[PDB]
Symmetry: C5
Subunit: 33 residues, 5 copies
Amino acid sequence: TQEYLLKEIMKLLKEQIKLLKEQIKMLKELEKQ
Amino acid sequence: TQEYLLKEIMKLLKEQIKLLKEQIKMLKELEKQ
Amino acid sequence: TQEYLLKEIMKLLKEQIKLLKEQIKMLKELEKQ
Amino acid sequence: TQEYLLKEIMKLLKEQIKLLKEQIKMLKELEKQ
Amino acid sequence: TQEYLLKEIMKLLKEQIKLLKEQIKMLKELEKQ
């Protein structure tokens, strides 16, 4: 069960990484303005 | 208890993800401007 | 020890959440401008 | 080793906290402009 | 297996930190504007 949960945590962390990348992309758009 | 706590950690990560999404929404509002 | 450290981790994640909420509030201030 | 690795994870979380505080300071600088 | 997953989690956290640093770099660029 701990392995299962640690893998679930890894998925959540990956989701956060994806969101952070999206923020960066938005910041880039703001810089272009 | 360790499984229980890992599940509590997952809940917190989910909150953070929700908050990251809200940041993105706000950045999009800034970009409109 | 593991229970103790997982609870410490939960404390750090709650601090992060707090900070993310503060970031959202600052983005709303920028939006007002 | 489990204790050691959870402590390493805490160090990384603290580094994230430090960075989030830095972002907040920056947003405050943007708010002044 | 658990040690391996904790290490994989550490790699994700490091990646988040790298992204957070990129965000700060972008904010500094915005501050120059």
